[PDB]
Amino acid sequence: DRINTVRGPITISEAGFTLMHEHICGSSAGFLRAWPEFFGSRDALAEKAVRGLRRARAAGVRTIVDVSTFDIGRDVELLAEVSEAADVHIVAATGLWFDPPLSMRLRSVEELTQFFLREIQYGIEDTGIRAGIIKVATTGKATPFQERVLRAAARASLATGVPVTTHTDASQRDGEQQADIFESEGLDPSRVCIGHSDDTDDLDYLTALAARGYLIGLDRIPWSAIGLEDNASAAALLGLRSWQTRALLIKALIDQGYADQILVSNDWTFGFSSYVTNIMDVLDRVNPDGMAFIPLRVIPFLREKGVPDETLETIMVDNPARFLSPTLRAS
Amino acid sequence: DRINTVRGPITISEAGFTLMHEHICGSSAGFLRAWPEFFGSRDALAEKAVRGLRRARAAGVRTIVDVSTFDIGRDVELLAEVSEAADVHIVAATGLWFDPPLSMRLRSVEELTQFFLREIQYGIEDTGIRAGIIKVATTGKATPFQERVLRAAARASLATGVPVTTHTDASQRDGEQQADIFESEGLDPSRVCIGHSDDTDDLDYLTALAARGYLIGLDRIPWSAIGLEDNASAAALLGLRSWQTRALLIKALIDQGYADQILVSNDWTFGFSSYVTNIMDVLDRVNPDGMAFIPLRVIPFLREKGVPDETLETIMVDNPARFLSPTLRAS
Ligand SMILES: [Zn+2]
Ligand SMILES: [Zn+2]
Numbered sequence: 083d084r085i086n087t088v089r090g091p092i093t094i095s096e097a098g099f100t101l102m103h104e105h106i107c108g109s110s111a112g113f114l115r116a117w118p119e120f121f122g123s124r125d126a127l128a129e130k131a132v133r134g135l136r137r138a139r140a141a142g143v144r145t146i147v148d149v150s151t152f153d154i155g156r157d158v159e160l161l162a163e164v165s166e167a168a169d170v171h172i173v174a175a176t177g178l179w180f181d182p183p184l185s186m187r188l189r190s191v192e193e194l195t196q197f198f199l200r201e202i203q204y205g206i207e208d209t210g211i212r213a214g215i216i217k218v219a220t221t222g223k224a225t226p227f228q229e230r231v232l233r234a235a236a237r238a239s240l241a242t243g244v245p246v247t248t249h250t251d252a253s254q255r256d257g258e259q260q261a262d263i264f265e266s267e268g269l270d271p272s273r274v275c276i277g278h279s280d281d282t283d284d285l286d287y288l289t290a291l292a293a294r295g296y297l298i299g300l301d302r303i304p305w306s307a308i309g310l311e312d313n314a315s316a317a318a319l320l321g322l323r324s325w326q327t328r329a330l331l332i333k334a335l336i337d338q339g340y341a342d343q344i345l346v347s348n349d350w351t352f353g354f355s356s357y358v359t360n361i362m363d364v365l366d367r368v369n370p371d372g373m374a375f376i377p378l379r380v381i382p383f384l385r386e387k388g389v390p391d392e393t394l395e396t397i398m399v400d401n402p403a404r405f406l407s408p409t410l411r412a413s
Numbered sequence: 414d415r416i417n418t419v420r421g422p423i424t425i426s427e428a429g430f431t432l433m434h435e436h437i438c439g440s441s442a443g444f445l446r447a448w449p450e451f452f453g454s455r456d457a458l459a460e461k462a463v464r465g466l467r468r469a470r471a472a473g474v475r476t477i478v479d480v481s482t483f484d485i486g487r488d489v490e491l492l493a494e495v496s497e498a499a500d501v502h503i504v505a506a507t508g509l510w511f512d513p514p515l516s517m518r519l520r521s522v523e524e525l526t527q528f529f530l531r532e533i534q535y536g537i538e539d540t541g542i543r544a545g546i547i548k549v550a551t552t553g554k555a556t557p558f559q560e561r562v563l564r565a566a567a568r569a570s571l572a573t574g575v576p577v578t579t580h581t582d583a584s585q586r587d588g589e590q591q592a593d594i595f596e597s598e599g600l601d602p603s604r605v606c607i608g609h610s611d612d613t614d615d616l617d618y619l620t621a622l623a624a625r626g627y628l629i630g631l632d633r634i635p636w637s638a639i640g641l642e643d644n645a646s647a648a649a650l651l652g653l654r655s656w657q658t659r660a661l662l663i664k665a666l667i668d669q670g671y672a673d674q675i676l677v678s679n680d681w682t683f684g685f686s687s688y689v690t691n692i693m694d695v696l697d698r699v700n701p702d703g704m705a706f707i708p709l710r711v712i713p714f715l716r717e718k719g720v721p722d723e724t725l726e727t728i729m730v731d732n733p734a735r736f737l738s739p740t741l742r743a744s
């Protein structure tokens with residue numbers, strides 16, 4: 083039983099403490115190769131990511147899942163470089179986020195399924211590195227193309243057992259329509275994580291998804307512009323709900339009996355060209371711990387609020403292993 | 414005095430018969446590297462392009478200008494491969510068309526100018542291949558970002574002397590606004606080709622641009638769905654005006670005294686992933702001559718209609734050389 087990482091297959095027990103929704107860089111296809119000076123240089127970005135992953139590993143992280151797709155500018159060779167230098171496993175993704183180019187947008191469900199299967203079963207580009215998760219997105223009601231993408235992701239998952247993870251506009255309850263589409267293709271909800279679910283306080287929405295068997299991605303816990311209310315860019319990106327408000331949704335779903343369905347992350351990054359210039363200065367001021375925020379701050383905060391150690395181990399170790407290890411079911 | 418090609422600098426006299434607006438592949442950034450099987454394979458696409466360029470060279474073509482940008486999926490290494498194997502010079506482009514990703518759309522004029530200057534002055538990616546033209550686009554009224562792109566293209570041209578060439582929606586007279594923006598940055602119109610100008614019959618529009626000193630790109634001469642009216646995709650792409658209607662605009666502008674300002678091409682390609690599946694089967698049925706259509710069919714057609722050989726030489730040889738060779742003026 084094995085999970086594909088950017089340095090090859092690992093056994094389930096090697097994943098350890100896992101961050102299920104992270105990025106080395108949030109960019110666009112071809113952008114890092116065409117304009118590396120945007121990031122200072124490719125080597126500056128790699129070095130920044132290695133320092134950050136090493137601090138995360140010191141705090142207990144063993145694996146991240148980089149849910150950057152083709153259209154997030156995923157560079158699997160960069161991921162393999164930083165994975166080896168930090169001694170942190172990195173799982174890469176296939177799928178499409180919400181910035182696909184025309185060459186993707188004009189494709190049918192069947193064509194997209196071929197593409198996703200290429201990246202899971204054969205490899206990414208000419209690297210032979212295989213994805214271990216499928217990432218998809220909506221930002222409100224699905225576009226016609228996004229519906230095709232979710233259907234293709236379901237077909238790819240149904241052939242390979244690799245799971246699907248999503249970007250939502252949680253405030254618009256996108257996970258409802260996502261689930262509908264996935265289920266119409268026969269996908270088991272145990273193979274799906276409805277992500278950015280901590281962006282909403284709506285427990286009716288969150289428990290309706292969890293009750294039908296979805297995994298719930300509380301993956302933006304450090305996202306907050308509190309203290310920076312006069313930076314419009316920062317507020318628009320991060321919102322004005324506190325990291326504590328977000329982290330308490332982890333406790334809320336535990337208290338409702340869904341501990342085995344929660345996945346927790348930071349949705350952090352080391353470079354970010356798909357937003358305003360100099361946004362990394364803001365992010366690194368907001369959350370200097372970066373990807374170590376979950377182990378260093380959230381885990382202690384939940385213990386202090388009464389969540390048992392055994393439960394926190396289930397969430398950070400066992401749930402990612404069960405979710406990632408390929409299957410048409412995971413329970 | 415020299416023009417940058419994908420195999421290095423050439424002197425002005427080496428360009429010869431030049432097609433100013435062509436593509437090896439119409440795609441999207443990263444797409445050919447991520448999904449080469451879309452095109453059958455990368456080698457099938459390369460071989461197709463070499464066969465086509467060799468037939469063009471046999472018909473008299475010596476140079477093409479591949480006006481594929483970053484967001485058209487320009488692969489300069491593919492261009493250099495096909496250039497060497499066909500013995501046809503290829504000039505590459507910088508700039509942005511109308512499918513930029515978020516990592517480009519969020520950039521300022523100054524940032525975009527740096528990017529364009531990178532590709533002209535330093536090189537594309539890590540290849541050391543330098544662009545010899547800047548490509549920009551609108552599709553009707555400029556978006557705010559497109560206005561930034563046109564301003565950056567003007568700044569890049571003003572530093573380097575490399576010209577600018579445009580995509581328009583000619584039916585909406587986009588060249589008027591393009592010219593306005595370019596002139597507000599101080600760009601000389603002799604450094605600008607307003608392209609797809611044969612997509613309209615409006616001579617008031619065409620002569621207003623030519624009178625102010627623009628070059629006029631009559632670059633879609635073989636584009637016609639006549640004979641395929643029941644193929645909605647094909648009609649929408651190609652229109653229902655004949656190649657003869659288009660070619661007669663070359664004569665019209667000659668007759669109005671603008672021979673020195675006309676640039677003629679095919680806007681052909683060998684692969685096309687940014688439109689509907691199997692569109693190349695349609696294009697190769699519509700125009701089996703491909704890029705050789707201008708020398709094989711248009712040049713004889715204009716001679717038959719009374720255009721002097723000397724004038725056709727001015728248009729296919731001298732105008733491209735004067736336009737491409739770097740300068741802040743070209744007259
Ligand atoms: Zn997201
Ligand atoms: Zn993310």
Ligand SMILES: [Zn+2]
Pocket residue numbers: 580581609
């Ligand atoms: Zn065009």
Ligand SMILES: [Zn+2]
Pocket residue numbers: 434435436480680
């Ligand atoms: Zn074109």
